Symmetry: C3
Subunit: 189 residues, 3 copies
Amino acid sequence: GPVYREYKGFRVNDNIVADFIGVPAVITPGETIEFSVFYTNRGRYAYPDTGLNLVIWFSDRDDLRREDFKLFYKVSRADWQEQDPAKCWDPQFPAEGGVHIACQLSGPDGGILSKPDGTVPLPEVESVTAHVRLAFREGITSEHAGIFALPGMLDAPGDKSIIPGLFGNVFGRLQQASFRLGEGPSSLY
Amino acid sequence: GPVYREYKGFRVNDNIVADFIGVPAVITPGETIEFSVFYTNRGRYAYPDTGLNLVIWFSDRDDLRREDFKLFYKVSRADWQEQDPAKCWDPQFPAEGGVHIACQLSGPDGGILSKPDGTVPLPEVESVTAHVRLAFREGITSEHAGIFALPGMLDAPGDKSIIPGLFGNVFGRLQQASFRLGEGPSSLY
Amino acid sequence: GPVYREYKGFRVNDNIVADFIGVPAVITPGETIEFSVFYTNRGRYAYPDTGLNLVIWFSDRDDLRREDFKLFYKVSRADWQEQDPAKCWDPQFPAEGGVHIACQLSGPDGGILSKPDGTVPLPEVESVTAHVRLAFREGITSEHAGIFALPGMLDAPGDKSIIPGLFGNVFGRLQQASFRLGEGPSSLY
Ligand SMILES: C[As](C)(=O)[O-]
Ligand SMILES: [Cl-]
């Protein structure tokens, strides 16, 4: 069994990391972007079932909700699907301000790692990708926002997910992508 | 106290890492790009005050100076500001050629981690972001350049910065973004 | 001497890592992109000779070959060159489908780390970059593809590369960039 750390009330294994590709540092309100994100087993313990969670957070306003953006994704080689608003955590409000909306992006990966019983085990060195399509509705903006990739794992076969709407009873290392939702930079020269 | 390694006579804690988002691999001279960069406490020691440093480096020429580019930044949810040329290191000249221009991008983060006395403590798992607007003047080019993100920390409360013009008496893990400054690639097909 | 783990019968040192800059999450068939990728020594053991390997992989088809894309690269401040198809591994076919084409992108870096004898030693904290130009021929597509950065090292000076066509008898930590080859996302709103 692997070593867990505690963060808030949850168990975190830093050996399950996540990487982003193609997140722009500025997103235009109303426009659709596609990026990729994948979590990888940098440890020696094979997890029996895994799935990605994504957290969308605005630091400078607290009114953003799941319905304020459109979110589609595809697990590795499987087909695209719309992210399910019922597979989300309720909005969380940090003590310093803002709001984050955590979304579950789990499911079979097209027969690369996934098994007939539906699990997506993560042997060492292996990875699972979500290709993600994201768009924020027009008229909403943020000057310091981010996406966090939160890998979710089931520690033992037949474990239950611990956060309502998210995948996993233990979690991997949070990965960040900071951006602004608004207008691009004016010329400095 | 955390474990430091010595590198070029400075104290480095590899548990304070940095990530880049949105850096292009080719930058057009004269054009403004915006990217984000953030440092994260991946260790268990909470630093009492922290700030980011950025190094702009050209490997194939040594004539670049701070005056050859315009640089603005914004710490997390604080306001945009112009980077201060007096809050920069003197040009450094590696033995193999080229020049590094080390720039301090510190300050309050808009009250997320920062405190009324101006300090930015970095608890574990926490991060601080700089949104960065950058443009190199027209007529300057480089075929192998990069930005290095150098997190700076004050190890104990009331410590003084050790590199004149930069923030910190100890430093985090150097993170790199390599790019060309010049023209994009012609179509290979 | 460093600690190796075994992976598919090869020796891997996770302290030699790789990072990507500017890989887009969607690449258009026929269009040329340029990105950079660099491997960094995050350990304390200096390797006497190093070189990057790049793997192009399609998960959803197995007919892709080295001839189906154009690949040029440049080691740090050395000159651009075309990747040599004879310095490639034979196509590898995972049992679950798809194909991987592993390509050697080694050589001197313009005298930054490289020495007159042609070797590229990698001291601690140091790094080697490849600027990469990549284009897939028109009419070929993939819904889940990626680039893997496989650092190659020689553990000892008189060691020989262990995979025909790739650099190294030991290898670093695999780094991934997942993308689709095809059309960008249509508007969700
Ligand atoms: C209540 As609303 C403006 O977040 O859809
Ligand atoms: Cl956009």
